Design an enzyme around this catalytic site. Structure first.
Site, PDB file in Angstrom:
ATOM      1  N   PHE A  60      -2.253  -1.862   7.709  1.00  0.00           N
ATOM      2  CA  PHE A  60      -2.227  -0.409   7.826  1.00  0.00           C
ATOM      3  C   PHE A  60      -0.869   0.106   8.295  1.00  0.00           C
ATOM      4  O   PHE A  60      -0.780   1.166   8.916  1.00  0.00           O
ATOM      5  CB  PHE A  60      -3.318   0.061   8.791  1.00  0.00           C
ATOM      6  N   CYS A 106      -1.178   3.931   9.085  1.00  0.00           N
ATOM      7  CA  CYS A 106      -2.241   4.624   8.358  1.00  0.00           C
ATOM      8  C   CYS A 106      -3.065   5.522   9.274  1.00  0.00           C
ATOM      9  O   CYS A 106      -3.700   5.049  10.214  1.00  0.00           O
ATOM     10  CB  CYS A 106      -3.158   3.619   7.663  1.00  0.00           C
ATOM     11  N   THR A 152      -6.774   2.230  -2.038  1.00  0.00           N
ATOM     12  CA  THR A 152      -6.674   1.068  -1.165  1.00  0.00           C
ATOM     13  C   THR A 152      -8.034   0.630  -0.614  1.00  0.00           C
ATOM     14  O   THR A 152      -8.294  -0.566  -0.465  1.00  0.00           O
ATOM     15  CB  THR A 152      -5.725   1.349   0.018  1.00  0.00           C
TER      16      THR A 152
HETATM   17  C1  HEM Z   1      -8.095  -0.162   3.356  1.00  0.00           C
HETATM   18  C2  HEM Z   1      -7.644   1.094   3.267  1.00  0.00           C
HETATM   19  C3  HEM Z   1      -6.181   1.522   3.547  1.00  0.00           C
HETATM   20  C4  HEM Z   1      -5.061   0.785   3.666  1.00  0.00           C
HETATM   21  C5  HEM Z   1      -4.905  -0.751   3.515  1.00  0.00           C
HETATM   22  C6  HEM Z   1      -3.961   1.692   3.948  1.00  0.00           C
HETATM   23  C7  HEM Z   1      -2.636   1.348   4.137  1.00  0.00           C
HETATM   24  C8  HEM Z   1      -1.624   2.182   4.577  1.00  0.00           C
HETATM   25  C9  HEM Z   1      -0.241   1.813   4.828  1.00  0.00           C
HETATM   26  C10 HEM Z   1       0.371   0.404   4.655  1.00  0.00           C
HETATM   27  C11 HEM Z   1       0.419   2.902   5.234  1.00  0.00           C
HETATM   28  C12 HEM Z   1       1.916   2.974   5.620  1.00  0.00           C
HETATM   29  C13 HEM Z   1       2.773   3.353   4.413  1.00  0.00           C
HETATM   30  C14 HEM Z   1       4.239   3.155   4.732  1.00  0.00           C
HETATM   31  O1  HEM Z   1       4.563   2.686   5.857  1.00  0.00           O
HETATM   32  O2  HEM Z   1       5.092   3.474   3.858  1.00  0.00           O
HETATM   33  C15 HEM Z   1      -0.520   4.006   5.259  1.00  0.00           C
HETATM   34  C16 HEM Z   1      -0.232   5.301   5.627  1.00  0.00           C
HETATM   35  C17 HEM Z   1      -1.037   6.405   5.427  1.00  0.00           C
HETATM   36  N1  HEM Z   1      -2.368   6.386   5.020  1.00  0.00           N
HETATM   37 FE1  HEM Z   1      -3.478   4.647   4.652  1.00  0.00          FE
HETATM   38  N2  HEM Z   1      -4.467   2.977   4.008  1.00  0.00           N
HETATM   39  C18 HEM Z   1      -5.825   2.901   3.769  1.00  0.00           C
HETATM   40  C19 HEM Z   1      -6.708   3.957   3.744  1.00  0.00           C
HETATM   41  C20 HEM Z   1      -6.380   5.277   3.955  1.00  0.00           C
HETATM   42  C21 HEM Z   1      -7.314   6.379   4.010  1.00  0.00           C
HETATM   43  C22 HEM Z   1      -8.839   6.207   3.831  1.00  0.00           C
HETATM   44  C23 HEM Z   1      -6.611   7.506   4.228  1.00  0.00           C
HETATM   45  C24 HEM Z   1      -7.096   8.971   4.379  1.00  0.00           C
HETATM   46  C25 HEM Z   1      -8.380   9.348   4.391  1.00  0.00           C
HETATM   47  C26 HEM Z   1      -5.214   7.136   4.322  1.00  0.00           C
HETATM   48  C27 HEM Z   1      -4.169   8.008   4.539  1.00  0.00           C
HETATM   49  C28 HEM Z   1      -2.885   7.676   4.914  1.00  0.00           C
HETATM   50  C29 HEM Z   1      -1.854   8.623   5.263  1.00  0.00           C
HETATM   51  C30 HEM Z   1      -1.961  10.163   5.285  1.00  0.00           C
HETATM   52  C31 HEM Z   1      -0.624   7.779   5.600  1.00  0.00           C
HETATM   53  C32 HEM Z   1       0.756   8.295   6.056  1.00  0.00           C
HETATM   54  C33 HEM Z   1       0.738   8.253   7.585  1.00  0.00           C
HETATM   55  C34 HEM Z   1       1.788   9.156   8.177  1.00  0.00           C
HETATM   56  O3  HEM Z   1       2.983   9.018   7.806  1.00  0.00           O
HETATM   57  O4  HEM Z   1       1.426  10.005   9.035  1.00  0.00           O
HETATM   58  N3  HEM Z   1      -5.107   5.770   4.152  1.00  0.00           N
HETATM   59  N4  HEM Z   1      -1.755   3.532   4.853  1.00  0.00           N
END
Ligand code: HEM
Ligand code: HEM
Lengths: 450, 440
Positions: B378, B385, B253
């Site tokens: 996010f 996120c 992403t």
């Molecule tokens: C522009 C960069 C990013 C975008 C647009 C993004 C987007 C998202 C979105 C939409 C979700 C929610 C998913 C859902 O509701 O089903 C999410 C969750 C998550 N993201 Fe990101 N993400 C990005 C970068 C990252 C990075 C850099 C990491 C880790 C180093 C990361 C780790 C996670 C994790 C572990 C979750 C699950 C959260 C939880 O349930 O505790 N993401 N992200």
């Protein structure tokens, strides 16, 4: 005073040729020399040559007034893509002297520090690559050495970046070069299956000349004062003409090939011997540490890595990466006061055998000890020939030695090395020598470069 | 009460012939353009309701009524990501547990620990581009992926993938890509069981490496860290699922974001001028310091607008906790699924005005003026996120160095073509970079 020349006996009409049916012809020739002595005639159908192994005879072979550089069958095959470049032209070909005079100032000690910065660039790329390895991982030594030497000759010579360290496989130019030279060495021994492999020799020649066209086209797009600049602008007015384009393309190919392979081999063997002789490694590391004090090595600090230079010269002694060169008899004459030679007759200097002459180096010839080169002037003349001989000697010698010394120096300065596999030496031959499969682990000192 | 808009049905096929495509989110965007703020979408055996308006989505983001749903895609990713943070139910024990344990690893205390390593990988990128010949061009999402994967590797697990020492993608990337072409192939046997082999190449290599030698990063907290409510561990199995999780979610992403941002910059020259000006004026150290990255306000705005137009995680799913009414019009029974269609949301004219398709970073001059639940790249709430600040910091640092050290050129006049694989990326996007020749 006249004597009969030793020879392995024939295989009928193939004569001696089936004996070089191997991955390692030079080494086989080394045992033949061990058996038959300082000189032996070797016959192939349509070709006869005489292998020399003693300093006594080779000092005679190096008399430029009696013997001149010969194009061996191997060189004649290389000429299919090296043309009339410096490495594959006769001494009395006009373009040899033309190009020699034009290109010689590019290998003055002046130009060498024009080259230095660019050398440091690639050296730093190597160091950075090794710094960034994980614990599991190991170094493929001749591969990375090849990456470094090719990128170095590319950058210093033609302001072109092969970017070999941005590839985990050999560069396309490398694959095609190695295939085109192992192919030539295959032609050393015209049937149709060989139609088909000729098709692959034309393709790898093509690939090398694509690259050359990239270097020329890139030069169009920009100001440089390197080898290419001298090839385009440079003038010999004994001839009064510049090198024409065809020859320039041959010179580019020539310098790309010759200006990296043997040096890669040299660095490889040197590291091998250092890890096989721990104390020599400690001493060399000590010199590297005491001398290389700037974040990136300046030139003048590189020049007193004297023990490093000696290490490299000893590595060249035991396994000279350009292991042989050919000569022809100018006129009828007698060699060693024993073997009469007719005009046109070929001699081959079997360099590792020469370098194992007990008459010169003592009885401990097989052991690796750099201090042999503590007093160079005690060494008899024409005893040490890793860079060929005379007017046809290696023009890139100072280039190669400076690069190798710089790189080996930075290596010893920045890393501790470990022979984690207790590597068993296996020498691959492709007109040049290399320790194939050589691997080590390097654990970093962590000295930054900035 | 009102009846929910829906695309035409084809008997047993329902709405499915309308999503016969490699790019479902964009097709659904067109359907949304046709039917408005909400529409039900039926495939055989599955019904979900797509939301596009802030009015309805702010309601969907009510955590007391709606919780994160694992769409079929997430459910398939769960085959190798298991009950890691991204693919676990909120009411699964390991979600809250791992959330509590890992959350401090994305505070700002940890964030300037990461800075140096981020600079390491970034410098590797800049150096790669400096060293290109005139002939050559840049494959943008490929190199961005190299950088993001290496960055999350080094910062997260102190492991160097060394992606810039390969002229091809790292094995993990290829394996991951068909691990998600897999997700939609499900809409290859044990060569997907094989991409599981390779993803645990990755995992076993990282564990053995942490074993072999002072680090206090994500992996360190995964090992030592413990949950103040339960006091119980991420068991080894879950730790490996989390490693996979962060490697996957934590790179693709962000790569997409950088790619789209660069795209929009080269398609909008004046914006490129302003962003470059900020980069030059602020980044004065040979390598960017931490707090100077924080003063790249306009670059941050650029990134936020890039996320507005094409959110690289383009959608997320929710389920109705209990029976309830949505928007005071549409009754929902417990368990019913909702999908936040984020790009449509970001194109809500009631919020952003009528020129939604224009790239204008200045929309984010005052982020707090923007109504809430209008900008959700996010995700939402406790399931938002966790890596948000990480991603934005990396992206700002990298985009900044990019603008500082190079002039960029859209030498092919690239026509945007967006590839969908649970994430969005501008496929085939290429540029030429001419160095300003500023040293590092
Ligand atoms: C522009 C960069 C990013 C975008 C647009 C993004 C987007 C998202 C979105 C939409 C979700 C929610 C998913 C859902 O509701 O089903 C999410 C969750 C998550 N993201 Fe990101 N993400 C990005 C970068 C990252 C990075 C850099 C990491 C880790 C180093 C990361 C780790 C996670 C994790 C572990 C979750 C699950 C959260 C939880 O349930 O505790 N993401 N992200
Ligand atoms: C370990 C490194 C090197 C070794 C062992 C080596 C060895 C040799 C040898 C034995 C010859 C004589 C060939 C013959 O007589 O048939 C030669 C010639 C030559 N070498 Fe090297 N060389 C090395 C590095 C280089 C480099 C770095 C360059 C260029 C940058 C170079 C360019 C040439 C050229 C152009 C000739 C032929 C010159 C002429 O005949 O006019 N060599 N070298």
């Amino acid at each position: 005073t006249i004597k009969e020349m030793p020879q392995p006996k024939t295989f009928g009409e193939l004569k001696n040729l089936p004996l070089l049916n191997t991955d390692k012809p030079v080494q086989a020739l080394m045992k033949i020399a061990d058996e038959l002595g300082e000189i032996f005639k070797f016959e192939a159908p349509g070709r006869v040559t005489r292998y020399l192994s003693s300093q006594r005879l080779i000092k005679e072979a190096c008399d430029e007034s009696r013997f001149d550089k010969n194009l061996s069958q191997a060189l004649k095959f290389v000429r299919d893509f090296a043309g009339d470049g410096l490495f594959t032209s006769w001494t009395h070909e006009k373009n040899w002297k033309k190009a020699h005079n034009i290109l010689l100032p590019s290998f003055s000690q002046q130009a060498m520090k024009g080259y230095h910065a660019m050398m440091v660039d690639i050296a730093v790329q190597l160091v950075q690559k090794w710094e960034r390895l994980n614990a599991d991982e190991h170094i493929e030594v001749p591969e990375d050495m090849t990456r470094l030497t090719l990128d170095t000759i590319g950058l210093c010579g033609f302001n072109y970046r092969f970017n070999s360290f941005y590839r985990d496989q050999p560069h396309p130019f490398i694959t095609s070069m190695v295939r085109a030279l192992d192919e030539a060495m295959n032609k050393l021994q015209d049937d149709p299956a060989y139609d088909e492999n000729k098709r692959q020799f034309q393709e790898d020649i093509k690939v090398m000349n694509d690259l050359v066209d990239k270097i020329i086209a890139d030069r169009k797009a920009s100001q440089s004062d390197d080898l290419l600049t001298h090839m385009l602008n440079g003038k010999d007015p004994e001839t009064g003409e510049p090198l024409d384009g065809e020859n320039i393309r041959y010179q580019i190919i020539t310098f790309l090939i010759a200006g990296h392979e043997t040096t890669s081999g040299l660095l490889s063997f040197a590291l091998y011997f250092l890890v096989k002789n721990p104390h020599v490694l400690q001493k060399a590391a000590e010199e590297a540490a005491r001398v290389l004090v700037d974040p990136v090595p300046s030139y003048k600090h590189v020049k007193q890595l004297k023990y490093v230079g000696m290490v490299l010269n000893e590595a060249l002694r035991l396994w000279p990466t350009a292991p042989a060169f050919s000569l022809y008899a100018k006129e009828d004459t007698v060699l060693g006061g024993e073997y009469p030679l007719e005009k046109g007759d070929e001699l081959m200097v079997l360099i590792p055998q020469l370098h194992r002459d007990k008459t010169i180096w003592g009885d401990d010839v097989e052991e690796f000890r750099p201090e042999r080169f503590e007093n160079p002037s005690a060494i008899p003349q024409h005893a040490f020939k890793p860079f060929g001989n005379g007017q046809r000697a290696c023009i890139g010698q100072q280039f190669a030695l400076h690069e190798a010394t710089l790189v080996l120096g930075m290596m010893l300065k920045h890393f501790d090395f470990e022979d984690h596999t207790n590597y068993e030496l296996d020498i691959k031959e492709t007109l040049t020598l290399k320790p194939e499969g050589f691997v080590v682990k390097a654990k970093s000192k962590k000295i930054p470069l900035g």
